[PDB]
XYZ file of C-alpha atoms in Angstrom:
769
model
C -24.539 -28.774 -110.068
C -24.820 -25.453 -108.255
C -26.767 -23.839 -105.445
C -30.192 -22.294 -105.971
C -28.680 -18.975 -107.067
C -28.590 -20.497 -110.578
C -30.894 -23.515 -110.968
C -34.229 -24.383 -112.530
C -37.113 -23.004 -110.472
C -40.842 -23.156 -110.213
C -41.872 -20.693 -112.866
C -43.518 -17.314 -112.392
C -46.177 -16.035 -114.753
C -45.667 -12.551 -116.148
C -48.966 -11.254 -117.586
C -51.884 -9.611 -115.808
C -55.612 -9.556 -116.469
C -58.673 -7.301 -116.510
C -61.901 -8.049 -114.631
C -65.359 -6.563 -115.094
C -66.925 -6.668 -111.642
C -70.363 -5.039 -111.883
C -72.281 -1.914 -112.839
C -72.318 1.399 -111.044
C -69.795 3.278 -108.931
C -69.987 2.004 -105.350
C -69.219 3.860 -102.131
C -66.192 1.699 -101.330
C -64.505 -1.590 -102.220
C -63.112 -3.216 -99.088
C -61.385 -6.570 -99.522
C -59.960 -8.822 -102.251
C -59.645 -12.601 -101.903
C -57.802 -15.306 -103.826
C -58.633 -18.994 -103.550
C -60.898 -18.643 -100.502
C -58.140 -16.816 -98.592
C -58.195 -13.235 -97.307
C -55.375 -11.712 -99.358
C -55.669 -7.906 -99.310
C -57.850 -5.406 -97.448
C -58.441 -1.713 -98.050
C -61.212 0.813 -98.675
C -61.122 2.102 -102.262
C -63.521 5.035 -102.629
C -62.777 6.118 -106.201
C -60.636 5.744 -109.284
C -57.287 5.063 -107.626
C -54.287 2.736 -107.545
C -52.846 0.259 -105.051
C -50.544 -2.763 -105.020
C -51.049 -6.242 -103.595
C -47.702 -7.352 -102.193
C -48.243 -10.207 -99.691
C -47.147 -12.999 -102.011
C -46.537 -15.013 -98.824
C -50.223 -15.991 -98.803
C -49.428 -18.950 -101.091
C -45.674 -19.292 -101.606
C -42.635 -18.270 -103.609
C -39.088 -19.612 -103.942
C -40.118 -22.348 -101.471
C -43.830 -22.861 -102.235
C -46.434 -22.461 -104.956
C -48.314 -19.318 -105.911
C -48.583 -15.898 -104.332
C -50.197 -12.848 -105.913
C -48.142 -9.677 -106.299
C -48.158 -6.343 -108.112
C -49.979 -3.055 -108.647
C -53.742 -2.880 -109.095
C -55.672 -0.222 -111.005
C -59.340 -0.086 -109.984
C -61.607 2.089 -112.120
C -65.002 2.753 -110.553
C -66.863 3.575 -113.766
C -67.359 7.243 -112.958
C -69.733 9.178 -115.245
C -66.760 10.895 -116.932
C -64.249 8.151 -116.180
C -60.982 7.698 -118.054
C -58.416 4.921 -117.676
C -54.663 4.785 -118.124
C -53.474 4.066 -121.651
C -51.604 0.972 -120.428
C -54.854 -0.949 -119.948
C -55.902 -0.158 -123.516
C -52.487 -1.187 -124.852
C -52.795 -4.489 -122.982
C -56.271 -5.065 -124.399
C -55.031 -3.449 -127.608
C -56.773 -1.867 -130.558
C -59.771 0.427 -130.245
C -60.920 0.440 -126.624
C -63.546 2.276 -124.554
C -63.156 4.051 -121.206
C -65.522 1.585 -119.470
C -67.517 4.420 -117.923
C -70.231 3.334 -115.502
C -68.833 -0.121 -114.641
C -66.513 -1.191 -111.825
C -63.464 -2.505 -113.700
C -60.328 -3.750 -111.946
C -57.006 -3.896 -113.800
C -54.308 -6.056 -112.193
C -51.077 -5.117 -113.963
C -49.115 -7.309 -111.537
C -46.977 -9.792 -113.436
C -47.786 -12.620 -110.986
C -51.334 -13.491 -111.871
C -50.271 -16.962 -110.714
C -47.550 -19.565 -110.872
C -47.702 -21.981 -113.810
C -49.999 -24.206 -111.722
C -53.226 -22.921 -113.081
C -54.394 -19.560 -111.690
C -56.678 -19.462 -108.672
C -60.150 -17.925 -108.576
C -60.849 -14.497 -107.084
C -63.513 -12.780 -104.999
C -64.216 -9.173 -104.032
C -66.291 -7.237 -101.513
C -67.962 -3.846 -101.920
C -70.915 -1.729 -100.816
C -72.843 1.327 -101.990
C -75.344 3.833 -100.636
C -75.200 6.978 -102.795
C -72.839 6.264 -105.686
C -74.136 5.356 -109.127
C -77.621 6.899 -109.001
C -79.067 7.793 -112.394
C -80.709 11.168 -111.886
C -79.239 11.554 -108.397
C -79.860 9.957 -105.028
C -83.181 9.955 -103.172
C -83.639 10.436 -99.409
C -79.963 9.577 -98.773
C -79.994 10.189 -95.004
C -81.676 6.835 -94.243
C -79.996 4.433 -96.704
C -77.099 3.325 -94.466
C -78.594 0.435 -92.480
C -75.601 -0.648 -90.416
C -76.036 -3.611 -88.107
C -74.005 -6.284 -86.334
C -73.846 -9.263 -88.693
C -70.649 -10.902 -87.534
C -69.436 -14.326 -88.612
C -66.975 -15.598 -86.033
C -67.490 -14.394 -82.477
C -64.006 -12.962 -81.978
C -63.941 -11.874 -85.632
C -67.045 -9.717 -85.237
C -67.639 -6.515 -87.192
C -70.769 -4.665 -88.260
C -71.872 -4.661 -91.901
C -73.515 -1.828 -93.822
C -76.819 -3.229 -95.042
C -78.909 -1.119 -97.421
C -82.423 0.138 -96.751
C -84.965 -1.950 -98.716
C -86.992 1.227 -99.249
C -84.102 2.691 -101.232
C -83.718 -0.656 -103.013
C -87.286 -0.448 -104.289
C -86.918 3.263 -105.055
C -83.942 2.432 -107.274
C -85.926 -0.397 -108.860
C -88.476 2.195 -110.051
C -86.264 5.306 -110.298
C -83.424 4.401 -112.685
C -83.490 3.809 -116.437
C -80.242 1.818 -116.206
C -82.257 -1.374 -115.651
C -85.917 -2.353 -115.513
C -88.517 0.365 -116.131
C -86.893 3.407 -114.522
C -90.091 5.224 -113.606
C -89.777 8.990 -113.327
C -89.484 10.348 -109.798
C -92.657 12.436 -110.047
C -94.726 9.301 -110.714
C -93.388 7.611 -107.546
C -95.141 8.435 -104.268
C -92.247 9.850 -102.246
C -94.108 10.213 -98.944
C -94.960 6.504 -99.025
C -91.280 5.573 -99.280
C -90.544 7.955 -96.410
C -93.219 5.999 -94.532
C -91.428 2.759 -95.403
C -88.067 4.124 -94.251
C -89.641 5.272 -90.973
C -89.969 1.681 -89.759
C -87.292 0.019 -91.905
C -84.497 2.132 -90.401
C -85.770 2.200 -86.809
C -85.956 -1.596 -86.578
C -82.752 -1.844 -88.653
C -84.161 -4.136 -91.371
C -81.576 -3.957 -94.144
C -80.702 -6.178 -97.078
C -77.686 -7.343 -99.067
C -79.456 -8.945 -102.027
C -77.805 -9.866 -105.334
C -79.241 -9.765 -108.851
C -76.897 -11.949 -110.909
C -78.275 -13.756 -113.958
C -80.972 -11.121 -114.104
C -84.651 -12.098 -114.175
C -88.021 -10.375 -114.574
C -88.234 -7.173 -112.557
C -91.599 -7.993 -110.981
C -90.084 -11.204 -109.598
C -87.222 -9.318 -107.949
C -89.679 -6.820 -106.470
C -91.721 -9.797 -105.257
C -88.607 -11.075 -103.492
C -87.846 -7.701 -101.892
C -91.460 -7.145 -100.819
C -91.530 -10.607 -99.263
C -88.319 -9.795 -97.396
C -89.836 -6.582 -96.025
C -93.388 -7.938 -95.977
C -95.011 -5.005 -97.747
C -97.335 -4.102 -100.601
C -96.426 -2.154 -103.719
C -99.480 -0.267 -104.934
C -100.664 2.829 -106.793
C -102.198 5.740 -104.907
C -105.908 5.995 -105.672
C -105.782 9.783 -106.046
C -102.480 10.647 -107.732
C -101.846 7.417 -109.620
C -98.197 7.469 -108.552
C -96.545 4.168 -107.738
C -96.430 3.669 -103.975
C -95.177 1.233 -101.344
C -96.918 -0.083 -98.232
C -95.680 -2.155 -95.307
C -97.741 -4.712 -93.391
C -97.105 -3.833 -89.751
C -98.793 -3.211 -86.388
C -99.669 0.393 -87.323
C -103.132 0.455 -85.770
C -104.444 1.519 -82.367
C -107.490 -0.832 -82.193
C -109.552 2.161 -80.969
C -110.061 4.559 -83.890
C -110.906 1.691 -86.239
C -114.405 1.853 -87.770
C -116.796 -0.829 -86.540
C -118.664 -2.709 -89.275
C -121.982 -4.450 -88.673
C -125.143 -4.775 -90.741
C -126.397 -1.453 -89.339
C -123.272 0.507 -90.347
C -122.392 -0.585 -93.895
C -121.887 -4.345 -93.912
C -124.058 -6.075 -96.517
C -123.080 -9.736 -96.106
C -120.220 -11.974 -94.994
C -119.450 -14.006 -98.111
C -117.155 -16.281 -96.038
C -119.237 -17.677 -93.168
C -117.807 -21.200 -92.796
C -114.932 -22.425 -90.642
C -112.613 -24.951 -92.293
C -111.287 -26.490 -89.064
C -108.188 -24.200 -89.245
C -106.617 -25.666 -86.103
C -103.737 -27.610 -87.721
C -101.980 -24.687 -89.442
C -98.207 -24.431 -89.866
C -96.389 -24.587 -86.530
C -92.683 -24.460 -87.458
C -90.624 -22.387 -89.893
C -87.056 -22.865 -91.131
C -85.717 -19.487 -92.266
C -82.701 -19.447 -94.589
C -80.666 -16.251 -94.953
C -77.227 -15.246 -96.231
C -74.505 -13.690 -94.085
C -72.213 -11.459 -96.195
C -69.312 -11.944 -93.767
C -69.500 -15.704 -94.241
C -70.823 -14.966 -97.745
C -72.754 -18.252 -97.621
C -76.196 -19.399 -96.527
C -77.312 -19.627 -92.902
C -80.400 -21.137 -91.295
C -82.653 -20.523 -88.292
C -85.247 -22.752 -86.633
C -88.368 -21.394 -84.942
C -90.783 -23.701 -83.110
C -94.162 -22.432 -81.917
C -94.152 -24.487 -78.730
C -97.872 -23.903 -78.187
C -98.842 -25.753 -81.368
C -96.252 -28.516 -80.961
C -97.401 -29.262 -77.407
C -101.005 -29.939 -78.490
C -101.284 -30.755 -82.207
C -98.762 -33.616 -82.287
C -96.563 -34.150 -85.342
C -95.074 -31.049 -86.953
C -96.458 -28.965 -89.810
C -93.207 -27.293 -90.848
C -92.199 -25.012 -93.703
C -88.782 -24.072 -95.082
C -88.919 -20.514 -96.424
C -86.367 -18.516 -98.403
C -85.057 -15.213 -97.034
C -81.710 -14.863 -98.798
C -80.115 -11.434 -98.614
C -81.014 -10.949 -94.974
C -77.477 -10.514 -93.602
C -77.644 -11.447 -89.893
C -79.201 -13.830 -87.407
C -81.061 -11.141 -85.469
C -82.974 -9.968 -88.540
C -83.403 -13.559 -89.720
C -84.999 -14.302 -86.349
C -87.188 -11.208 -86.660
C -88.516 -12.307 -90.056
C -88.938 -15.907 -88.877
C -90.968 -14.799 -85.856
C -93.026 -12.455 -88.026
C -93.927 -15.251 -90.445
C -94.528 -17.858 -87.737
C -96.843 -15.608 -85.724
C -98.647 -14.401 -88.857
C -99.316 -17.799 -90.431
C -99.871 -19.847 -87.248
C -102.078 -17.708 -84.971
C -105.792 -18.063 -85.746
C -105.779 -17.390 -89.483
C -109.287 -16.533 -90.684
C -110.171 -15.151 -94.120
C -113.098 -12.728 -94.359
C -114.839 -11.983 -97.656
C -117.049 -8.956 -97.049
C -119.792 -7.441 -99.202
C -119.753 -3.693 -98.568
C -121.847 -0.733 -99.685
C -120.377 2.747 -100.228
C -119.101 2.693 -96.639
C -115.477 1.758 -97.434
C -114.954 3.506 -100.774
C -111.762 5.054 -99.382
C -110.639 1.762 -97.837
C -107.566 0.583 -99.721
C -105.817 -2.815 -99.685
C -103.735 -3.053 -96.529
C -106.088 -0.889 -94.468
C -107.497 -2.018 -91.120
C -111.103 -2.232 -89.956
C -113.217 -3.952 -87.311
C -116.146 -6.227 -88.197
C -118.972 -7.430 -85.945
C -121.714 -10.013 -86.559
C -122.753 -10.804 -82.980
C -126.401 -11.814 -83.414
C -126.199 -14.174 -86.417
C -122.640 -15.530 -86.668
C -121.576 -14.722 -83.099
C -118.119 -13.318 -83.860
C -116.794 -10.892 -81.269
C -115.849 -7.573 -82.841
C -112.610 -8.628 -84.521
C -110.002 -6.418 -86.193
C -109.092 -7.446 -89.739
C -106.508 -6.490 -92.357
C -107.842 -5.376 -95.735
C -106.567 -7.226 -98.789
C -107.949 -7.372 -102.321
C -110.766 -4.912 -103.031
C -113.144 -4.909 -106.016
C -114.451 -1.383 -106.543
C -117.905 -1.317 -108.106
C -119.374 0.312 -111.196
C -121.962 3.089 -111.259
C -124.570 0.295 -111.067
C -124.452 -2.567 -108.522
C -123.223 -0.280 -105.769
C -121.322 -2.671 -103.557
C -117.599 -3.334 -103.133
C -116.173 -6.761 -102.301
C -113.397 -6.599 -99.697
C -111.108 -9.580 -99.214
C -109.861 -9.376 -95.645
C -107.366 -11.300 -93.527
C -106.902 -11.695 -89.784
C -104.406 -9.445 -88.036
C -100.783 -9.454 -89.162
C -97.758 -8.632 -87.015
C -94.477 -6.727 -87.010
C -91.025 -7.822 -85.847
C -90.269 -8.575 -82.200
C -87.929 -10.614 -80.007
C -88.792 -14.164 -78.919
C -85.749 -16.404 -79.493
C -82.051 -15.813 -78.808
C -80.701 -17.683 -81.847
C -77.226 -16.214 -82.223
C -75.260 -19.327 -83.160
C -72.000 -17.402 -82.721
C -69.683 -19.798 -84.603
C -66.242 -20.540 -83.087
C -64.335 -17.962 -85.156
C -63.431 -20.505 -87.823
C -62.218 -23.146 -85.339
C -58.590 -22.081 -85.020
C -57.687 -21.102 -88.606
C -54.647 -19.038 -87.638
C -51.370 -20.315 -89.092
C -49.136 -17.223 -89.091
C -45.442 -17.552 -88.189
C -43.899 -16.476 -84.899
C -40.575 -16.455 -83.076
C -39.271 -19.549 -81.306
C -36.284 -20.813 -79.352
C -33.162 -21.303 -81.466
C -29.539 -22.352 -81.000
C -26.479 -22.072 -83.247
C -22.892 -23.319 -83.196
C -19.979 -24.141 -85.482
C -20.406 -27.222 -87.654
C -18.223 -30.071 -86.323
C -16.352 -32.695 -88.311
C -19.084 -35.238 -87.554
C -21.606 -32.976 -89.286
C -19.446 -32.828 -92.416
C -18.969 -36.605 -92.354
C -22.705 -37.247 -92.005
C -23.991 -34.623 -94.461
C -21.058 -34.264 -96.893
C -20.756 -36.865 -99.680
C -17.398 -38.631 -99.574
C -16.660 -37.644 -103.180
C -15.963 -34.071 -102.058
C -15.319 -34.699 -98.348
C -11.635 -34.947 -99.211
C -10.034 -31.618 -100.167
C -11.892 -29.826 -97.338
C -8.796 -27.990 -96.140
C -8.042 -27.052 -92.536
C -9.107 -23.418 -93.065
C -12.756 -24.330 -93.741
C -15.711 -24.014 -91.372
C -19.439 -24.722 -91.568
C -22.402 -23.105 -89.815
C -25.195 -25.112 -88.206
C -28.030 -24.550 -85.750
C -31.346 -25.898 -84.493
C -34.618 -24.364 -83.336
C -38.029 -25.438 -82.088
C -41.191 -25.267 -84.173
C -43.498 -22.523 -82.837
C -46.712 -23.653 -84.541
C -48.043 -26.860 -86.063
C -48.646 -25.086 -89.382
C -44.933 -24.198 -89.518
C -42.990 -26.136 -92.158
C -39.296 -25.227 -91.843
C -36.951 -22.334 -91.061
C -34.833 -20.215 -93.391
C -31.395 -19.033 -92.277
C -30.459 -15.374 -92.615
C -26.712 -14.763 -92.473
C -24.888 -11.407 -92.409
C -21.179 -12.251 -92.421
C -18.250 -9.838 -92.366
C -18.580 -7.265 -95.138
C -22.072 -8.465 -96.057
C -24.892 -5.911 -96.212
C -28.067 -7.227 -94.605
C -28.822 -10.788 -93.496
C -28.758 -12.697 -96.780
C -31.318 -15.510 -96.980
C -29.372 -18.668 -97.841
C -29.735 -22.216 -96.566
C -32.651 -23.688 -94.620
C -33.049 -26.293 -91.906
C -35.687 -28.580 -90.441
C -36.820 -28.103 -86.843
C -35.041 -30.812 -84.878
C -36.380 -32.397 -81.716
C -35.831 -30.364 -78.549
C -35.546 -31.314 -74.893
C -35.490 -29.112 -71.782
C -32.993 -30.391 -69.221
C -34.501 -30.185 -65.736
C -32.375 -32.438 -63.479
C -29.126 -30.444 -63.074
C -27.173 -33.419 -64.386
C -23.493 -33.658 -63.438
C -20.425 -34.460 -65.528
C -20.812 -38.251 -65.401
C -24.628 -38.325 -65.396
C -26.059 -40.871 -67.832
C -29.778 -41.208 -67.008
C -31.004 -37.908 -68.459
C -34.131 -36.778 -66.599
C -35.706 -33.977 -68.644
C -39.087 -32.676 -69.795
C -40.653 -30.926 -72.796
C -40.915 -34.034 -74.976
C -41.243 -32.419 -78.392
C -43.270 -34.138 -81.100
C -40.116 -35.277 -82.915
C -38.246 -36.027 -79.672
C -39.122 -39.729 -80.082
C -37.816 -40.025 -83.660
C -34.185 -40.542 -82.587
C -33.043 -44.137 -83.016
C -30.886 -45.762 -80.324
C -27.295 -44.564 -80.395
C -28.189 -41.212 -81.960
C -26.059 -38.137 -81.229
C -27.373 -35.054 -79.425
C -25.734 -31.782 -78.390
C -26.354 -30.041 -75.069
C -26.023 -26.305 -74.470
C -26.898 -23.493 -72.072
C -27.920 -19.832 -72.306
C -25.652 -17.863 -74.642
C -24.749 -14.179 -74.357
C -21.766 -11.839 -74.171
C -18.999 -13.880 -72.559
C -21.211 -16.968 -72.676
C -20.915 -17.046 -76.480
C -17.469 -18.654 -76.266
C -17.658 -22.429 -76.675
C -14.378 -23.157 -74.867
C -15.972 -22.562 -71.448
C -19.696 -22.698 -72.250
C -21.051 -26.196 -71.617
C -21.533 -27.443 -75.184
C -21.371 -31.245 -74.991
C -22.287 -33.852 -77.598
C -24.055 -36.821 -75.982
C -24.935 -40.069 -77.756
C -28.485 -41.133 -76.876
C -28.643 -44.851 -76.076
C -32.264 -45.704 -75.217
C -35.346 -43.635 -74.408
C -37.199 -44.172 -71.121
C -40.277 -42.055 -71.714
C -39.585 -38.532 -70.526
C -36.127 -39.632 -69.349
C -33.588 -40.677 -71.988
C -30.351 -42.634 -71.592
C -27.341 -41.230 -73.466
C -23.558 -40.899 -73.224
C -21.451 -37.878 -72.278
C -18.666 -36.289 -74.303
C -18.828 -38.490 -77.400
C -17.290 -36.690 -80.382
C -15.871 -33.183 -79.914
C -16.575 -31.995 -76.350
C -15.448 -33.256 -72.956
C -18.438 -34.177 -70.752
C -19.640 -31.357 -68.517
C -22.318 -30.488 -65.947
C -25.640 -28.730 -66.468
C -28.463 -27.052 -64.564
C -32.210 -27.562 -64.694
C -34.309 -25.639 -67.238
C -31.499 -25.901 -69.810
C -31.963 -26.900 -73.465
C -31.037 -30.191 -75.136
C -31.009 -30.558 -78.924
C -30.664 -33.723 -81.006
C -28.842 -33.111 -84.286
C -28.445 -36.551 -85.902
C -29.178 -36.025 -89.618
C -30.824 -32.659 -88.844
C -29.767 -29.032 -88.912
C -29.514 -26.040 -91.194
C -26.637 -24.358 -93.014
C -25.756 -22.686 -96.303
C -22.878 -25.095 -97.065
C -20.440 -22.175 -97.355
C -16.813 -22.925 -96.444
C -16.487 -19.832 -94.284
C -12.899 -19.331 -93.165
C -11.912 -19.260 -89.519
C -12.217 -15.917 -87.725
C -14.940 -14.861 -90.211
C -17.520 -14.301 -87.491
C -21.007 -13.608 -88.846
C -24.393 -12.614 -87.433
C -27.324 -14.889 -88.258
C -31.086 -14.963 -87.729
C -33.281 -18.027 -88.283
C -36.710 -17.231 -89.741
C -39.533 -19.801 -89.526
C -42.023 -20.055 -92.365
C -45.604 -21.230 -92.853
C -47.676 -22.169 -95.887
C -50.299 -19.416 -95.810
C -48.224 -17.034 -93.698
C -44.878 -17.327 -95.434
C -41.682 -16.459 -93.610
C -41.502 -14.761 -90.212
C -41.047 -10.953 -90.103
C -38.705 -9.962 -92.941
C -35.865 -8.915 -90.632
C -37.469 -8.332 -87.205
C -36.319 -11.698 -85.827
C -33.674 -11.819 -83.076
C -29.983 -12.413 -83.846
C -26.984 -14.247 -82.402
C -23.338 -13.376 -83.040
C -21.370 -16.520 -83.924
C -17.569 -16.333 -84.010
C -15.381 -18.440 -86.310
C -12.564 -18.789 -83.758
C -12.603 -22.579 -84.281
C -13.078 -25.006 -87.162
C -13.600 -28.722 -87.786
C -9.951 -29.423 -88.677
C -8.898 -29.544 -85.017
C -8.015 -32.936 -83.509
C -10.158 -34.771 -80.988
C -9.367 -34.409 -77.267
C -8.222 -37.292 -75.046
C -10.596 -39.756 -73.405
C -11.117 -41.304 -69.982
C -9.079 -38.607 -68.252
C -8.104 -40.130 -64.891
C -5.490 -39.352 -62.256
C -4.148 -40.663 -58.958
C -1.422 -40.079 -56.378
C 1.322 -42.265 -54.914
C -1.023 -43.546 -52.190
C -4.412 -42.915 -53.844
C -3.216 -44.066 -57.265
C -6.388 -45.863 -58.424
C -8.991 -43.391 -59.733
C -9.349 -39.604 -59.708
C -11.335 -37.660 -62.287
C -10.420 -34.208 -63.563
C -13.426 -32.883 -61.636
C -12.058 -34.695 -58.553
C -8.959 -32.853 -57.286
C -6.035 -34.726 -55.761
C -3.789 -33.340 -53.038
C 0.010 -33.117 -53.305
C 1.411 -33.182 -49.767
C 5.049 -33.015 -48.701
C 5.023 -36.825 -48.413
C 2.755 -39.369 -50.083
C 3.005 -41.575 -46.986
C 5.217 -42.144 -43.967
C 8.502 -43.536 -45.220
C 7.595 -42.372 -48.736
C 8.839 -39.518 -50.899
C 6.798 -36.447 -51.863
C 3.452 -37.299 -53.421
C 3.276 -37.221 -57.222
C -0.021 -36.534 -59.001
C -0.128 -38.835 -62.038
C -2.746 -38.162 -64.724
C -3.674 -40.430 -67.635
C -5.620 -40.053 -70.872
C -6.694 -42.133 -73.863
C -5.645 -41.674 -77.479
C -8.388 -40.869 -79.988
C -8.355 -40.411 -83.768
C -10.953 -38.008 -85.150
C -10.744 -39.455 -88.664
C -10.643 -43.009 -87.309
C -13.644 -42.365 -85.055
C -15.628 -40.907 -87.945
C -19.372 -41.103 -87.381
C -18.929 -43.301 -84.296
C -19.453 -41.122 -81.170
C -17.169 -43.018 -78.791
C -18.195 -41.914 -75.279
C -15.626 -40.050 -73.214
C -15.872 -42.999 -70.814
C -14.650 -45.162 -73.701
C -10.996 -46.101 -73.992
C -8.491 -45.161 -76.685
C -9.015 -45.359 -80.449
C -5.488 -44.505 -81.591
C -4.114 -40.973 -81.735
C -4.352 -38.985 -84.931
C -1.092 -38.978 -86.930
C 1.310 -36.474 -85.403
C -1.030 -35.332 -82.621
C 0.533 -34.378 -79.289
C -0.961 -33.643 -75.883
C -0.816 -30.132 -74.426
C -0.363 -29.214 -70.758
C -0.948 -25.810 -69.151
C -0.532 -24.905 -65.473
C -2.359 -22.020 -63.777
C -1.394 -21.070 -60.230
C -3.801 -20.179 -57.434
C -3.402 -16.545 -58.530
C -4.371 -17.446 -62.103
C -0.824 -17.019 -63.424
C -0.021 -19.409 -66.288
C 3.125 -20.721 -64.627
C 4.207 -22.954 -67.514
C 2.988 -24.719 -70.641
C 4.007 -28.118 -72.000
C 3.510 -29.740 -75.394
C 4.887 -32.554 -77.525
C 3.506 -35.088 -75.027
C 2.943 -38.132 -77.238
C 2.274 -40.180 -74.093
C -1.097 -40.921 -72.535
C -0.269 -39.603 -69.049
C 1.799 -37.026 -67.185
C 3.270 -36.938 -63.681
C 3.595 -33.951 -61.350
C 6.064 -34.776 -58.557
C 5.879 -32.545 -55.498
C 9.345 -31.183 -56.280
C 8.546 -30.810 -59.987
C 5.324 -28.873 -59.394
C 6.972 -26.828 -56.630
C 9.253 -25.298 -59.268
C 6.611 -23.096 -60.912
C 3.897 -23.621 -58.275
C 6.311 -22.380 -55.625
C 5.160 -23.546 -52.196
C 7.581 -21.041 -50.665
C 6.417 -18.353 -53.106
C 2.701 -18.584 -52.334
C 1.819 -17.459 -48.817
C -1.056 -19.917 -48.369
C -0.249 -23.201 -46.636
C -1.710 -25.235 -49.515
C -1.268 -24.008 -53.080
C -4.359 -24.924 -55.112
C -2.969 -25.002 -58.647
C -5.306 -25.167 -61.646
C -4.221 -27.773 -64.209
C -5.490 -27.541 -67.795
C -4.910 -30.138 -70.514
C -5.662 -30.438 -74.226
C -4.273 -31.869 -77.471
C -2.905 -30.295 -80.638
C -1.862 -31.343 -84.134
C -0.411 -29.164 -86.901
C -0.243 -26.142 -84.612
C -3.879 -25.651 -83.653
C -5.196 -27.232 -80.459
C -8.537 -28.810 -79.584
C -11.755 -26.818 -79.245
C -11.931 -27.330 -75.463
C -9.812 -28.617 -72.576
C -10.110 -30.417 -69.259
C -9.496 -28.812 -65.866
C -7.681 -30.604 -63.040
C -6.906 -29.212 -59.592
C -3.887 -29.947 -57.396
C -2.978 -28.662 -53.928
C 0.699 -28.215 -53.010
C 1.375 -27.992 -49.272
C 4.409 -26.638 -47.435
C 6.073 -28.213 -44.396
C 7.739 -27.060 -41.167
C 11.506 -27.357 -40.562
């Protein structure tokens, strides 16, 4: 076996592909998606080249998929040419694909062996790809706010339907392609006049192409207009059904002014007409269907049960315009619909379908001078004189009644990108090697070996794990090797003391309850220059006994650190069976700089190298012996109990009739190998000293001078008689009455000493003659 630098891997794919998107150069291509995920964004305005490089969207050496590589996009220009590489890939005789938008992804990662994902693209056009040139280009760009996702809002560039219909009749590239001269230009200017002012655009699609008249039917229904031929020229023309009448200049028709007969004189009880409309449109941003309700409260409040209608308005890109069309239809079809069939003499020979006129039959039918819209007209022959005019009650334009902007919740928290988080690092102890290192190779781990380990909190739920970047001595850049799982974290908030056992803390992480009774946790404090050293910094391993909700019961100084004190707002990390390291036997003194990078599924790893760092020194290793346990001391009189944190005085006499006081200290023997995975609490007794281990004693005077050092102490306790201590801690030397000496203790075996040491305090007092 070997590490991932040479092992079987999830397999890349190496070959690209070529996609034919659609006809006609477009103004710009904006965004490219893979598997319903926003992969790459960018405005391509012509034959150009780019590269998609965020493979992190799906995975890599730790997850599946992830697109990557250059992308050639050819816009099908009239004189377009493509790179020879595309033709070699496709091979043999090949064309230049002029006129069609063709994308060539030369990137070797089309997908991982898991079968390739599906793609999507986004584009728009206003002036590009016009056979014979563009027409009236300065009103084709119907921009309007069509956002999907309230905080994700952005306007979209809908096209003018007038230009849509002009293309439908002014290009040979599909359909009929009527010549420009035979199309009534001024009528399409008329259409644009109102289509642009009210901002009625469209984003229709014409896939799986059908009969042209049907598509024009769809567009006309969207705009609510009439395609027709001018009576005089014969050119094809467009009309819109709007409120373009002043109800004053209209000609008045009665029997004395041209009306011959009302062929439709009955009333069909038209009181129960449609009263509700369900409009369905398509938002390009969501790129899926949307719906709008519109209730005519007047009809619902009187007629009873509904008379509803679901109508299709796909291609309308926003809710405002969807509402406009819904209101238009509801007010047109619901408000007093009456059909007039009118027999007319040569009084309306100019009247053309869509015109407006006012009819009056007050003395026979008793209808009060109504305005009517002209529909079908049957022009007469040289005999028979009259013209039949089919006429319909007044229509309406767009206007504002409802406020139906659903304003979805921006995808309901879809963000899963990585971010920085709290982290902590330290040298791997012997317990870590015992727990994580198989016994087959645990032996032969010499004394010059060291292991790196650390823990960090998960910043986001979508985060999976964290990769470890290490830049050791001589290394160039933080190499990515080894990864770890986010262990449970706890924020100390009770300023616990040395002997504290009931740990009152907060910040109960999600995994903070996964530790079984007796687990082992490591405490720490803020680390920085000077605070990086672990000899003085409070780094204590505590064995958790039983959880009590927020508070947890654990032991102090279990495996490789004497118990210490802490302050509120600190950090507590459980490390039983958790951590992260590269499993590299880094030698002592080989200090390295590391940076832990979290990773997510769709967001990949955190910033490539922008994460913070922490300088870890290899001054210590796991080969050192364990320190003593149950460090206690007493004097000649008070010779019962005195902790290292509890100083004991050394007066000129222990008691009246007694010799000078002697400060006696005791300790318990512990065997690191014998202890193994068992984290015997510092309050626990002795477990047998390691073979050849000896205790170490160091004395620091009140002035900080290391007066003397002692070693080879195979015993469990030492004694400091007043006379003995007065030798180096000279009572006569120091000017102060009492001499507060600082006593430090530790253990050593095979030269090197323990990773930390205890600190006792003793006061030596002078005496008068």
